[PDB]
Design a protein around this motif. Structure first.
Motif, PDB file in Angstrom:
ATOM      1  N   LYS A  92       0.826  -1.201   0.000  1.00  0.00           N
ATOM      2  CA  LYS A  92       0.000   0.000   0.000  1.00  0.00           C
ATOM      3  C   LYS A  92       0.865   1.257   0.000  1.00  0.00           C
ATOM      4  CE  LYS A  92      -3.905   0.640  -0.271  1.00  0.00           C
ATOM      5  NZ  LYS A  92      -5.306   0.211  -0.542  1.00  0.00           N
ATOM      6  N   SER A  93       0.312   2.350  -0.513  1.00  0.00           N
ATOM      7  CA  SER A  93       1.035   3.616  -0.573  1.00  0.00           C
ATOM      8  C   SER A  93       0.805   4.434   0.694  1.00  0.00           C
ATOM      9  CB  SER A  93       0.594   4.420  -1.799  1.00  0.00           C
ATOM     10  OG  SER A  93       1.713   4.836  -2.563  1.00  0.00           O
ATOM     11  N   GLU A  94      -0.207   4.050   1.464  1.00  0.00           N
ATOM     12  CA  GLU A  94      -0.532   4.748   2.702  1.00  0.00           C
ATOM     13  C   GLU A  94       0.703   4.890   3.587  1.00  0.00           C
ATOM     14  OE1 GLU A  94      -2.505   4.212   6.247  1.00  0.00           O
ATOM     15  OE2 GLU A  94      -2.598   6.373   5.856  1.00  0.00           O
ATOM     16  N   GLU A  95       1.503   3.828   3.651  1.00  0.00           N
ATOM     17  CA  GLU A  95       2.715   3.835   4.463  1.00  0.00           C
ATOM     18  C   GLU A  95       3.590   5.038   4.123  1.00  0.00           C
ATOM     19  OE1 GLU A  95       5.746   0.938   5.383  1.00  0.00           O
ATOM     20  OE2 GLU A  95       4.969   1.726   7.282  1.00  0.00           O
ATOM     21  N   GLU A  96       3.698   5.338   2.833  1.00  0.00           N
ATOM     22  CA  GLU A  96       4.507   6.463   2.377  1.00  0.00           C
ATOM     23  C   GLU A  96       3.772   7.784   2.591  1.00  0.00           C
ATOM     24  OE1 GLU A  96       7.088   7.759  -0.349  1.00  0.00           O
ATOM     25  OE2 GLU A  96       8.292   6.865   1.260  1.00  0.00           O
ATOM     26  N   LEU A  97       2.446   7.738   2.499  1.00  0.00           N
ATOM     27  CA  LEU A  97       1.625   8.930   2.681  1.00  0.00           C
ATOM     28  C   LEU A  97       1.675   9.408   4.129  1.00  0.00           C
ATOM     29  CD1 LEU A  97      -1.531   8.148   0.512  1.00  0.00           C
ATOM     30  CD2 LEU A  97       0.184   9.927   0.123  1.00  0.00           C
TER      31      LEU A  97
END
Length: 161
Positions: A92-97
């Motif tokens: 998921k990109s949430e981790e980076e967000l």
């Protein structure tokens, strides 16, 4: 079995392209053609920080080499790279967000306000007058919210970063 992968590669992102030549260049060490030997195909995985299995690899080529050459070419590598991606529990990109959300939210509220928006000015340096702070807030707000939530914030950078 190339189709099953063709769908993953065609749907993949430019990232896989960078991570490819990035490591590939290491093996070839700046050569004209450094085909990673199958026996080493199990090491390349460990070099990417993970828990590979060179013992199972021998079982793969044993029955099918997916080519019958004994080496690992571009397509061969690109395929194997995504082949592992299949069946996972972390993507998921949430981790980076989360990181960004913090940069634009350093207090104790968890929301990007007018004061948190102007922060961008410093993120780039200096330009435009105060109007830039008000205008921006008007471009991200004024939609029946009064503030900028996560989905609204991450969505903004997701279209300009």
């Amino acid at each position: 079995m190339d189709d099953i992968y063709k769908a993953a590669v065609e749907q993949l992102t430019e990232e896989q392209k960078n991570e490819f030549k990035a490591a590939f260049d290491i093996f070839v060490l700046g050569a004209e053609d450094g085909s990673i030997s199958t026996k080493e195909l199990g090491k390349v995985m460990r070099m990417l920080g993970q828990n590979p299995t060179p013992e199972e690899l021998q079982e793969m080529i044993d029955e099918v080499d997916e080519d019958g050459s004994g080496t690992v070419d571009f397509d061969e590598f690109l395929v194997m790279m995504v082949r592992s991606m299949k069946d996972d529990s972390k993507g998921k990109s949430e981790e980076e967000l989360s990181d960004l959300f913090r940069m634009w939210d350093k207090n104790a509220d968890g929301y990007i306000d007018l004061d948190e928006l102007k922060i961008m000015l410093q993120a780039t340096g200096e330009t435009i007058t105060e109007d830039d702070i008000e205008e921006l807030m008007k471009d991200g707000d004024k939609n029946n919210d009064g503030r900028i939530d996560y989905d609204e914030f991450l969505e903004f950078m997701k279209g300009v970063e």
